[PDB]
Design a protein around this ligand. Structure first.
Ligand SMILES: Cc1cc2nc3c(=O)[nH]c(=O)nc-3n(C[C@H](O)[C@H](O)[C@H](O)COP(=O)(O)OP(=O)(O)OC[C@H]3O[C@@H](n4cnc5c(N)ncnc54)[C@H](O)[C@@H]3O)c2cc1C
Ligand SMILES: Cc1cc2nc3c(=O)[nH]c(=O)nc-3n(C[C@H](O)[C@H](O)[C@H](O)COP(=O)(O)OP(=O)(O)OC[C@H]3O[C@@H](n4cnc5c(N)ncnc54)[C@H](O)[C@@H]3O)c2cc1C
Lengths: 674, 673
């Protein structure tokens, strides 16, 4: 997802760096997000979420990504508490033929858990395996409590982790227009030019967006009349005051949303810069630029710099609300897991789910694509799924409960083609693909919010269908580690520059750890519009290298030469150059202005379980239905919601079936039903 | 581009429909855009833009799209005014092997389909001799004065034109969530349900964005404290007070930008709906939805409906300023040209350019890709272009002036890789592709705004590189025309329904004018709508989205949508997917983008600074305030040639015609003079 570190500190000499799963798990155990400010999800997840009545349940999970697998794990924790004679049967549907779930020696590489997967690229060298480049989930914030919670389930607290060397955490070169900086962190003493305008605009914009944890409030967009930095401290507290979290949940965060959800991040940056320029805090850029040109230069300069770990420019259209969520979720470091491939995290969680079930959870995998979900009739197994196998044969199955653990663009066709009210019958399936249909009687929509309002039912489906997928592309290569020591590679702070943030088209480029003779280079990580500007792997790689072929003037040398980084990219080994272009080939929800109302409806959907007679058997579980798209943390939160709702539904609306700690997952939100 | 028709009228019985090029040309001849409010570009273009000193000029145009070819035409008009012994030689670079420029334009009998003029082209689909589907420009607003001006040059005023049957102008089915409507236009008498909430939100949002031209002001975002409709009438007037135009240009429009360029269209819609809902001007959706769900339902309902010609939802991130430009450029109809393929417009303009040159313009075409531009050396011709031919051989050539007629993502590598100040020597070219470079000495950037401020030079380059390209995809099929008269195709206002606007994934679908067979634009999607189906085969995915149960008001049992069968029945051999992601975009400004696009729009004013001696101009819809319309490409071309004239006269604006002068001096200059 989007790395947002307001007050960037260099890694060198930074203290309190976590070295195990357990150490990271502790850092975010208390953090509560502002849309769910009554509950720490890691605390909710510390014990089984609640209790089910005695019975033999049949549940489906559609999707084997982080969402579906965390939901499975929570169902295992529940299963274990059932009495003798009782248990849960789960059918997990996963259409992806390369899913870890369908893997039947040596460990098979390159398996997927949805958007957690690595590309396996031939390198030539027979003494090594294939080169591995992670194309989805890569690194995990210290504050990601629920993620580290599940990592402990998967690997144990003792398992070692390594720090991720982001841009700005290590010596970095930044290039925007005519401006060049070399830097680490945000202390002027660690900038090659301590008087840099980049450092000046960083201070102004971080000050205006985040403000200060102590003393006077200096931020432009307060929450509860104070700086966001002060609110973040409350949300992260082990033991905040009576009613403080309630008031954030019901008053002050909704008031911030009401005021600022129609304001983009780029618009907010410009408002801050304009005030600082008028105040004289930001000086004219030089003796030539007019007022608007100066302000615009600073806005764009900030745009490419961000907070120092890569630019926010391509994210300028996101709502200030969405940016503010990330600002509140404050951290200094991200870490990698002790795995060869990150799919191992989700696979280990799947295996652990079965373990914690204590024999009361039985799982069966189906290599089938779900085409339709609906309710049929009013009896006990009223949740229907219509699916197709690898031979395109149709299958229909009925369940007590279903968790739809697929992101929004994949969920749409499953939930939107059965209308919005009761129907005497429907012939469902993929008729346009020429596939067999199946007739269902007394059909109700799957995402059933009302027995009397088709508009209510339409709202959830139309909301899902209009969420925004943020897109990104990555270009990977492998370079001799010694290349970083060529005489033409500059050094800063006693180290070769290994990270580059630039307006060249590459956006962000850096050496990535090996979870050595060779080093992995993320030659380009581009977001949104930056991912389509340049529109054989080596051929495509050369087009990117050609963008780096630019003359760069440095304050040192009187004659500009081709950028050194061009020469570094050209040192990349030829065999294992790899382009992950989303438009030829990974997207996650990131909210635009006005999108809160759609994403938050999804977030709260599981509260339908409070309405007993509605008897809706479908829950949703994905980072698409969270307020942290682009992070496993969001997928995991949504799965925790889904299973908390399922428990309440199983108990006919009785919230006392949830644990004391889990209860606010449902009752701490505005319900979606009367 | 984006069709924006606030007060949509059905085509049936509509009066004042233009029937020739000339009639359309006269309709939009006076309109002035708010960022150039002192000048009607068609009026400026009525005569040659100015005069050049005697000489034999060597000019390059990079790009043979609408921008480059309009620029060529204006250079022809200029050339004809030169004295005996004087002239203009133009080298036109066009890298596209499928360009009309490389297929013997005006020296061909067989009539080859599928040739391109940049983002104007049609796909040729073999059907069993072929089927043509426009994938770029094909319909022109009545108010597009400069477009119709050049259509006149290309075809004559007498050339016939045909009205384009947009969704909403003809009987249309609309589906959003649980809501279905069958309608034509905005008059509730032509709606199947005149009490539709869609009609209610239409009125409220069109009211709040556009307001009322005569009488009481009802808009939420005023310009000069009045409704935008009132400002539109001033900008379109034949002879409004000069001082009124000046105050729009210098005060009222800039103040609108200062206030609202940080507000997206979607945000503005929600503000309007929230106020109306709170006041009770919008009624309850039903007895169940709470206040925020109701407001949200209405915002999203409006999002899918737009003003009646397709949804604005996928454009909700655009700046309100950008939307407002389209609201001010008010019209009721768009028209098609008397062509088989729209490339014929640009080809005809190219041939006319040579004609109007009166023999004083000579034009040569290079099938070469330009990789770099710069100023270098000490000769009179200091504008350098570095290019590669089809054998990847490097070529360098110097010119007196250059017009860079390519959109912003294509311009970036040409202007951004040589730094931002004087350099002693540089090896320019595509070194990363393994191609040969060429050494230039005493090098200055091509887009030279300052001899002392690298920041000023960086601003124009960085601005170009951060413009937003709006994306779209189209899926076309051919159906038997008689299918449309069958019982299973619904009728409204005496006509089969031939247009559908929906949240199905297809977004907008309609019959397009080409008979036994009809062309169906099965799906036209913008921005996020163009990627929702990402996860003849692709055509089937779309038919599958249309396989959805639709409940209509009444006693009828819900059945699969009728439109499924129309799409299912399309001839197989003719289905065509034009998916931008596997296969043209245009500039559409986000919030804050004005400061970047307007710098590009004003760039040609550098010609006012005599000593600067910058020989490069830019010409594309990317450097206009009407991205996605030929009107914008043409406006930028007019800017480029006006600036070129001023530069060729060492800053002397009196070399421009009286009517063209404001093209340069009506804008805030980009240089100190
Ligand atoms: C490029 C990018 C960068 C990222 N960076 C980070 C990061 O820094 N840190 C971090 O923690 N996370 C990161 N992530 C975010 C993380 O990858 C996601 O939050 C998470 O993997 C999403 O899990 P999910 O269960 O919501 O959905 P998915 O991973 O999309 O899983 C959905 C599954 O359902 C299956 N499926 C879909 N439709 C059907 C159907 N109709 N029938 C049955 N099966 C179906 C799919 O095949 C898939 O396996 C990144 C992801 C991407 C896109
Ligand atoms: C999908 C879509 C819908 C549209 N709808 C309409 C409409 O409704 N009505 C209307 O009026 N207009 C419409 N247009 C808008 C119209 O197409 C454009 O405004 C116009 O065609 C753009 O012209 P241009 O000269 O700016 O650029 P382009 O058409 O992009 O031309 C640039 C030319 O330069 C060439 N070139 C690029 N790089 C180089 C290089 N380095 N070396 C040399 N040659 C190079 C290209 O090959 C190209 O031929 C539509 C376009 C598209 C995208």
């Amino acid at each position: 997802g989007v790395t947002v570190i307001p007050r960037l500190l260099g890694l060198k000499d930074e203290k309190k760096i976590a070295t195990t799963v357990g150490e990271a798990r502790l850092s975010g155990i208390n953090y509560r997000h502002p849309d769910s400010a009554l509950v720490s999800y890691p605390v909710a997840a510390a014990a089984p979420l609640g209790r089910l009545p005695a019975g033999n349940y049949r549940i489906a999970i559609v999707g084997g990504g982080a969402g579906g697998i965390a939901a499975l794990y929570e169902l295992g924790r529940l299963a274990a508490t059932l009495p003798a004679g009782s248990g849960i049967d789960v059918q997990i549907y996963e259409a992806d033929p390369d899913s870890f779930l369908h893997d039947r020696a040596i460990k098979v590489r390159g398996l997927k858990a949805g958007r957690v997967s690595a590309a396996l690229v031939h390198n030539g060298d027979p003494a090594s395996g294939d080169t591995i480049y992670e194309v989805g989930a890569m690194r995990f914030p210290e504050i990601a409590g629920l993620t580290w919670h599940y990592a402990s389930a998967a690997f144990g607290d003792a398992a070692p982790i390594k720090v991720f060397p982001n841009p700005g955490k290590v010596p970095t070169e930044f290039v925007f227009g005519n401006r060049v900086d070399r830097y680490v962190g945000s202390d002027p003493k660690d900038w090659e030019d301590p008087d840099s305008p980049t450092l000046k605009v960083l201070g102004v914009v971080a000050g205006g967006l985040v403000g200060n944890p102590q003393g006077e409030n200096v931020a432009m967009y307060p929450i509860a009349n104070v700086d966001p930095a002060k609110i973040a401290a409350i949300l992260n507290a082990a033991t905040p005051p009576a009613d403080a979290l309630e008031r954030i949940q019901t008053k002050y965060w909704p008031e911030f949303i009401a005021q600022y959800d129609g304001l983009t991040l780029g618009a907010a940056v410009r408002e801050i810069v304009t005030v600082a320029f008028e105040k004289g805090t930001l000086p004219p850029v030089d003796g030539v630029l007019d007022v608007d040109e100066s302000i615009s230069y600073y806005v764009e300069l900030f745009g490419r710099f961000g907070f120092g770990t890569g630019g926010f420019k391509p994210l300028y259209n996101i709502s200030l609300v969405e940016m503010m969520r990330l600002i509140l979720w404050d951290y200094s470091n991200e870490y990698t897991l002790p795995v060869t491939e990150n799919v191992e995290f989700i696979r280990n969680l799947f295996l652990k789910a079965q373990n914690v079930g204590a024999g009361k959870l039985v799982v069966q995998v189906r290599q089938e694509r779900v085409a339709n979900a609906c309710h049929s009739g009013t009896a006990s197994a009223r949740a229907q799924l219509l699916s197709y196998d690898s031979h395109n044969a149709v299958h229909s199955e009925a369940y007590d409960f279903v968790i739809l653990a697929v992101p929004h663009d994949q969920l749409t066709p499953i939930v939107s083609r059965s209308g919005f009210e009761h129907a005497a019958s429907q012939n469902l399936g993929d008729a346009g693909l020429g596939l067999e249909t199946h007739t269902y009687n007394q059909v109700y929509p799957p995402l059933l919010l009302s027995d009397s309002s088709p508009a209510a039912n339409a709202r959830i489906v139309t909301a899902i269908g209009q969420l925004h997928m943020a897109r990104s592309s990555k270009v990977f290569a492998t370079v001799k580690t010694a290349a970083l020591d060529q005489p033409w590679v500059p050094q800063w702070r006693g180290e070769p520059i290994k990270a580059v943030v630039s307006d060249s088209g590459l956006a962000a480029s850096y050496v990535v750890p090996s979870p050595p003779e060779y080093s992995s280079l993320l030659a380009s990580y581009t977001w949104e519009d930056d991912s389509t500007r340049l529109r054989t792997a080596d051929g495509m790689y050369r087009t990117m290298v050609n963008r780096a072929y630019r003359y760069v003037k440095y304050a040192g040398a009187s004659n500009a030469q081709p950028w050194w980084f061009y020469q570094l990219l050209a040192e990349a080994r030829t065999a294992d150059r790899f382009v992950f272009d989303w438009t030829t080939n990974g997207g996650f929800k990131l909210d635009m202005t006005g999108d809160h109302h759609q994403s938050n409806l999804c977030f709260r959907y599981h509260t339908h379980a409070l309405a007993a007679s509605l008897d809706n058997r479908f829950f949703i579980a994905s980072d698409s239905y969270s307020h942290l798209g682009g992070w496993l943390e969001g997928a995991f939160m949504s799965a925790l919601n889904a299973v908390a709702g399922l428990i309440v539904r199983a108990n006919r609306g009785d919230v006392s079936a949830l644990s004391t700690e889990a209860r606010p997952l449902v009752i701490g939100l505005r319900p979606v039903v009367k």
